[PDB]
Amino acid sequence: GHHHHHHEFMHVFDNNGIELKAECSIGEEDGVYGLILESWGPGDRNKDYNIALDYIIERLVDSGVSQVVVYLASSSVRKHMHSLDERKIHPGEYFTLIGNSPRDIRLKMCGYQAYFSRTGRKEIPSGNRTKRILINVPGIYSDSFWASIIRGELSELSQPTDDESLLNMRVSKLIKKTLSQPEGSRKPVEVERLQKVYVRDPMVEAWILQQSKGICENCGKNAPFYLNDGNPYLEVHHVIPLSSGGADTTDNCVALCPNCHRELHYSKNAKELIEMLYVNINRLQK
Amino acid sequence: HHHHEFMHVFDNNGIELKAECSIGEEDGVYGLILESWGPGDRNKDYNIALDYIIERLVDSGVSQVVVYLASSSVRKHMHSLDERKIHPGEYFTLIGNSPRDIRLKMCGYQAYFSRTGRKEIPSGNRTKRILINVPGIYSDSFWASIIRGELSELSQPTDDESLLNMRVSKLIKKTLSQPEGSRKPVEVERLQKVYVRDPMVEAWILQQSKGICENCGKNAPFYLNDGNPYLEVHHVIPLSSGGADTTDNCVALCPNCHRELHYSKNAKELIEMLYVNINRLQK
Ligand SMILES: [Zn+2]
Ligand SMILES: [Zn+2]
Ligand SMILES: [Zn+2]
Ligand SMILES: [Zn+2]
């Protein structure tokens, strides 16, 4: 319901539950979804930008978010830069929050905004450091997650949930802590849900599997196991995902073993392997 | 006002036969229009292609057809459909020991016609342009399945991942020309039934594995960002089947081993070996 009703801006709450002068919103823009922090304006409109950003980073880390992706989201940048790889403010595919304190992470984040102008990228970080920005956590499409980050009341890490992205996020943090044997649920709670899924083409899948000849196209190795019908098991992967508006065509699909298909989603060196395949496989067109 | 979807008849393995046809409507009659075995070996394997058609028609419930001559000479010189009908009786029935012997009956009737009209002595061609009509049926997708076999049904796109797998599995057997596909696929909001899952259970299981799988020995395929070893937790008795979300019903596996327990037929035996090796598990 984003039509006929002028959406009002949400404001980030401090640790005492009190509203900050720091406009924000939760939404999707140009294929990417997350928290859109509004810019520090002329005449001190969003005076608490920096301190509000400190709290967001703080709360993401305590909720188990290790890595994020921050995009430049002022109206000019989105016009003059059409790709997602270029609108991102930081080098590498994922900005990590693990290393340092929330202020240090923020200073750096605010710093990388200065390397942008309205035409494009600058030689030096001379620009403004308090622009409109979009913070993406990969895998997370939940409005309630971002709502809690703005609100300041977070869920406990042990909290059960139906969201599998939210589960993984919490586990990734729980692995670092010493866990005693948890009791669990002998009768787990089922829940009806809606999910968005794309209609896929069996011919594009089937064509890509035949051409592979049952060998993974990233690593050189052959398929791990065989199906009941006798065929080898690989998994077809869209190099430009369908969530990010990619095509369902043979010229951006690739057959991989389960392990490599996982590598390309989550690995620390995932940017190397995705470019590597655009050289090797000549049908793959970016 | 005639419409046509042009095709070649396919065999059971998806190979394009030398037997061009169409799903068309001509003079009110809608059906499969199989082109002639030509003057210079045009449509070489007409008779082969017609056997598949007769086989598929019988497989899909059709026992009766009407066959008209549809050559442009006959069209001109024979002025009613009733005289263009090759067989006596309202229908030609698809019954016999073989589709081939049925085809010989059907083509036997064709010999009783010249290019200009009906022939007193059957001394004519047995391999002519004909329209195979099934009155009552007006589906292109029905005739597409008669023309292309099971390959036309299996090629249909879907959101259902289980059905997408059944179809893909069967399409790997067939020979396939290049698909093209869609450059802007449609997203569907569909209903789903998921379970509320405990992250203490999952995180405990991943800790006690120490980065190695519980059916193959190997380490994690890659180290996840922030240095974690990448494995996947899987419920040995599914939550669908009344499985508990407990440490005694979970195992850590690499993606290869995870898919192996799901999609193999030999998975039902792999499960048994987890109860032997991993003595934590209860059932
Ligand atoms: Zn994929
Ligand atoms: Zn591989
Ligand atoms: Zn599983
Ligand atoms: Zn394994």
UniProtKB/Swiss-Prot annotation, chain A:
Name the InterPro entries for this protein: HNH, HNH_nuc, NA-targeting_endonuclease
| Coiled-coil intervals, chain numbering | none
Instruction: Supply the EC number(s).
Output: 3.1.21.-
- Any one GO molecular-function label of the UniProt entry: endonuclease activity
Using the record's annotation, list all stretches that form the HNH domain: 216-266
The record's listing under SMART domains reads:
HNHc
Alphabetized, the UniProt keywords read:
Endonuclease, Hydrolase, Nuclease, Restriction system
Q: Does the keyword Nuclease apply?
A: yes
Q: Which of the seven top EC classes does this enzyme belong to? A: hydrolase
| GO terms, biological process | DNA restriction-modification system
The free-text function statement in the UniProt record for this protein reads: Restriction of 5-methyl and 5-hydroxymethylcytosines at the specific DNA sequence 5'-C(me)CGG-3'.
Please share what else the UniProt entry notes about this protein. Answer: Encoded by the SOS-inducible cryptic lambdoid prophage e14. UV treatment leads to prophage excision and reduced levels of McrA.
In Swiss-Prot or TrEMBL terms, this protein is called: Type IV methyl-directed restriction enzyme EcoKMcrA
User: What organism is the protein native to?
Assistant: Escherichia coli (strain K12)
Swiss-Prot record, chain B:
Q: Which InterPro entries match?
A: HNH (IPR002711), HNH_nuc (IPR003615), NA-targeting_endonuclease (IPR052892)
Q: What is its EC number?
A: 3.1.21.-
**Location of the HNH domain:** 213-263
Q: Which GO terms describe its biological process?
A: DNA restriction-modification system
Keyword set includes Cell membrane = no
Query: Which is one Pfam family of this protein?
Result: HNH
Q: Which UniProt keywords apply?
A: Endonuclease, Hydrolase, Nuclease, Restriction system
Give a yes or no for keyword Nuclease in this entry: yes
Top-level lineage group: Bacteria
Among the GO molecular function terms of this UniProt record, one is:
zinc ion binding
Q: Tell me the enzyme class.
A: hydrolase
Q: What does this protein do?
A: Restriction of 5-methyl and 5-hydroxymethylcytosines at the specific DNA sequence 5'-C(me)CGG-3'.
Anything else the record notes? Encoded by the SOS-inducible cryptic lambdoid prophage e14. UV treatment leads to prophage excision and reduced levels of McrA.
PANTHER family with a match to the protein in the record: SLL1193 PROTEIN, TYPE IV METHYL-DIRECTED RESTRICTION ENZYME ECOKMCRA
This protein is called Type IV methyl-directed restriction enzyme EcoKMcrA
